[PDB]
Design a protein around this nucleic acid. Sequence first.
DNA 1: CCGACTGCGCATCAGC
DNA 2: GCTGATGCGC
DNA 3: GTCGG
Length: 327
Amino acid sequence: PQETLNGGITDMLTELANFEKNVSQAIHKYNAYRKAASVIAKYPHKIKSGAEAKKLPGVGTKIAEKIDEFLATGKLRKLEKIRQDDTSSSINFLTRVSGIGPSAARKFVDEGIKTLEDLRKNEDKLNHHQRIGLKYFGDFEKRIPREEMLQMQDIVLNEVKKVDSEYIATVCGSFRRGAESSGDMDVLLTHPSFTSESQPKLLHQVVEQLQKVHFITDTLSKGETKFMGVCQLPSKNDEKEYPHRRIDIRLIPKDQYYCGVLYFTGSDIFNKNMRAHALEKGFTINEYTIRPLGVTGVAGEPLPVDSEKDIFDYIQWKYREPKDRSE
DNA sequence: CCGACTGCGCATCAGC
DNA sequence: GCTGATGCGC
DNA sequence: GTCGG
Ligand SMILES: Nc1ncnc2c1ncn2[C@@H]1C[C@H](O)[C@@H](COP(=O)(O)OP(=O)(O)C(F)(F)P(=O)(O)O)O1
Ligand SMILES: [Mg+2]
Ligand code: NA
Ligand code: NA
Ligand code: NA
């Protein structure tokens, strides 16, 4: 877990993972490559051979021999050739625009659209989300200093309580994990009249207020229980404007807060793993509930969290505080 | 050999 | 008009 | 791609 220990290898595997997701559209190879990259990143030795790497869970014959080629040459012919391929590297680049996934990137590249400038020249072919991701392309790849996160949280908390005192608003994600920077802002939201009962307008009013005071600036998606959009800190004197930022709001049944906060905290690789073996344990976890598997695939009446969680005791693992949840 | 693989709300697309 | 499937990014 | 039925 020392980073320069096997960074070349895990770099290589992460680049392979991205090519599989964005170009081959092979999501399970993508996950396989990332699981291998992850397990190797936590391995406390410098790998000397593919055979050594193959001992780790999630490393197999194919990654083993990619490793031997990489150790033997410091390169991978397949990646070498892929990077040089105009179609493939354009498809992969385009997926960095929010809203453009592997399918859209492919469709765009097939009709001659390969760069940010081609997209701008072709805004008719873009949907609402895609135009916004293009508009804020740079900003959306910028990190948010924790200091700004705190200002953002002040505004969110302040404006939420205005709408209705009984709302609860939690800022989750890496911020809740104490990170000194974040890629976006995730707001977990609950209201006492949302558990089992419902009025289905609680989220709309939160959103509307945040737009009113010019905090939220764009909408990407907006439904009953989930908002995805764009927001922005106000600026000062002649102050340089802050970057536009991605913000999501999830409205959970108050019934199910703890499962909500575990999941939106998370981290994404951490939920994959926490859920992946929870399957081993005879359980399945989502943002709503933890449930057992009784027969050979069961639901199970999910009765209510009583205390903190010990979701973790149910699947028999020690509590990793949000700080230790990057993995 | 061959299927599972973490889990899901909303926008859009496919179709009746 | 509608239902159901898929893409997308969580 | 990897793991396991
Ligand atoms: N496929 C998934 N499965 C489970 N949880 C997920 C998944 N994808 C995303 N989540 C997440 C778990 C995740 O914690 C939460 C928010 O997603 P985020 O904002 O993309 O991830 P973080 O905020 O942690 C970040 F570190 F990447 P940031 O600081 O750069 O924004 O839903
Ligand atoms: Mg985030
Ligand atoms: Na292995
Ligand atoms: Na994208
Ligand atoms: Na997010």
